Design a protein around this ligand. Structure first.
Ligand SMILES: CC(C)CCC[C@@H](C)[C@H]1CC[C@H]2[C@@H]3CC=C4C[C@@H](O)CC[C@]4(C)[C@H]3CC[C@]12C
Lengths: 49, 50
């Protein structure tokens, strides 16, 4: 019974790990996109002088 | 002023960057150390390297 319970718990842990990996990718991508979307328009406008 | 960066500011930004890199390093080391058979597979290449 303990082995079955641990297997179910490990399934939950695996789901959490997969969600963590997706969110790592999403949050790094969002950091890059926010940094660009805030500043790059004005920076390219100034560089085109 | 903005003609140059003061030494104090340069040093503080440098140590902040070093601290950020070491935080990333600690996160990576913890990710590697707490891997268990029930979630992660045994990479033989990394094991042979390290
Ligand atoms: C992020 C880590 C690696 C560096 C931290 C220190 C930062 C603030 C340092 C590293 C290199 C530095 C630059 C190097 C050279 C110049 C040209 C000078 O005419 C004005 C200051 C300026 C533009 C410096 C500003 C401060 C600077 C950007």
């Amino acid at each position: 019974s303990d082995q079955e319970s641990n297997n179910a718990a490990a399934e939950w842990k695996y789901v959490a790990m997969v969600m963590d990996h997706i969110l790592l990718g999403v949050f790094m991508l969002v950091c890059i996109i926010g940094t660009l979307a805030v500043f790059a328009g004005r920076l390219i406008e100034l560089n085109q002088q | 002023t903005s003609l140059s960066v003061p030494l104090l500011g340069r040093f503080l930004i440098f140590v902040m960057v070093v601290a950020t890199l070491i935080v990333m390093n600690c996160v990576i080391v913890l990710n590697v150390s707490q891997r268990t058979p029930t979630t992660h597979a045994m990479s033989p290449r990394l094991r042979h390297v390290l």
